Amino acid sequence: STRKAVIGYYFIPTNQINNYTETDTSVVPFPVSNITPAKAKQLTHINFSFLDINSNLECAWDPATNDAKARDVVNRLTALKAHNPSLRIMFSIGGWYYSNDLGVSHANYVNAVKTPAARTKFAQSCVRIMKDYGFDGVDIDWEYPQAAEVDGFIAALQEIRTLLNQQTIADGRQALPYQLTIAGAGGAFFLSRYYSKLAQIVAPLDYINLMTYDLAGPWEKITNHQAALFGDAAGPTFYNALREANLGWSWEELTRAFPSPFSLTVDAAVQQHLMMEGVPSAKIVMGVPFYGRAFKGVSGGNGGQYSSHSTPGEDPYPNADYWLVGCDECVRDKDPRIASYRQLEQMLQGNYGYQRLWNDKTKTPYLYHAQNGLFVTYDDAESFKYKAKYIKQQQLGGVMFWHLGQDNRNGDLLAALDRYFNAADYDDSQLDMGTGLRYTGVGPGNLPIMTAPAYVPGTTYAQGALVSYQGYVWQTKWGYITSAPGSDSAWLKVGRLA
């Protein structure tokens, strides 16, 4: 009955910091004053974003940042702690723009973690920045260290953890200790970069916040839900890259863990984490998007789902055709491919030609514009009922979302998440989780409780026979077997004794 984490990003670009104002939404659309006391009480963490790693290989603000203005913005966030003694203002280092393989600062990430001396200088800079600006913990969003850089990343996280723990003691902060989190991959292709060492990555963290969204987008040929909870057999499937990770597992072990192809869903990412030994459910946080992804040039037949499309994938958006009818924020941001939940509500409400439809397998909503051939995948307070029930059922740590400025003006999405976890009068015991496709993989970290007859020496066991032995349930891979389970390759450990 530990409180579920509710971790919301506060993203503010450098130009908005430098021109910070709370009275002109054309300059700063989402100032700190829009985070009311009521919203502050519903959050456990705000991730202030983004800081970077500079060419000196230290955590640093964008050098174009006006420091006085930056401190003013952060001070406004930390003042919110007055409303909620559990609230932390984290800061996030990285993000896609800075840290992707082709990002402007990518080499600084690689180099900062490369050697013990670099790791010390980097780790010290993270805690120095945390203390100088008054933040409550460090969140690292490197998207993503490659398999070869992973050992350095692990050591960097370990070293930051030690320094944060020292700082908690120095400041008498045992009631609200300084924390360390990362934004983790929420799909198997990026996850495969560091998957084999997942337990080492998670060990120094309070949470790993899964980016379980952007699972569809203009870079894929076929439209799809970007954050389906469960799978739809009518939707696309994907190769399971995890089966090629350097795990040292056998064919049967790999096959049971990593069905391929599979449905790229939130459940898949969560289960992929739980399959690894040493990765506790309580540290896994489910990311949800407060925005939708829009596609144009879609066909009818299934409400724009699973259709080819003509949505540019380039950055920046390559022309001035802002084709997402009714999306005023898209004109402001010169990109019709992403729309906040705040804007999507208005688009539904106005005379713009959208239908709201629901996929009861994926448990997510979508908009379809039949006249122009548009499809929008997004999440809302209804999809969040299923995701919140899943968080509770699977004993996850909580929820994370990008970003606070995209909730509607009344903060309905954040209020819904808070309600589903904390409201005494909310009852989801009868909420039907549907017949969407579950990720069926089992690994060492999530063996089901089972029972079976005790193993008997001398007995000749056929293929598929189940026995209990030395604390586990085992299945023969072929027949006929007479060896003791665990003594050779013939037995698969399939379950654990209660």
Curated annotation (Swiss-Prot):
Pfam families per the UniProt record, alphabetical: Glyco_hydro_18
Coiled coil spans: none
GO molecular function (one): chitin binding
Top-rank taxon, per record: Bacteria
EC number assigned by the record: 3.2.1.14
Matching InterPro entries: CBM5/12, CBM_sf_5/12, Chitinase_II/V-like_cat, Chitinase_insertion_sf, Glyco_hydro18_cat, Glyco_hydro_18_chit_AS, Glycoside_hydrolase_SF, Glycosyl_Hydrlase_18
Broad class of enzyme this protein falls into: hydrolase
Keywords: Carbohydrate metabolism, Chitin degradation, Glycosidase, Hydrolase, Polysaccharide degradation, Signal
Domain Chitin-binding type-3: 437-497
Disulfide bonds: none
SMART domains documented for this protein: ChtBD3, Glyco_18
Biological process per Gene Ontology, one example term: chitin catabolic process
Catalytic site positions: 143
Record PROSITE patterns: GH18_1, GH18_2
Catalyzed chemical reaction(s): Random endo-hydrolysis of N-acetyl-beta-D-glucosaminide (1->4)-beta-linkages in chitin and chitodextrins
GO CC, alphabetical: extracellular region
Residues spanning the signal sequence: 1-40
Residues noted as binding chitin in the record, renumbered to the chain: 67-68, 94-97, 144, 211-214, 402
Residue ranges occupied by any GH18 domain in the UniProt entry: 41-424
Family statement: Belongs to the glycosyl hydrolase 18 family. Chitinase class II subfamily.
Name of the protein in its database record: Chitinase B
Gene source species: Serratia marcescens
Record gene name: chiB
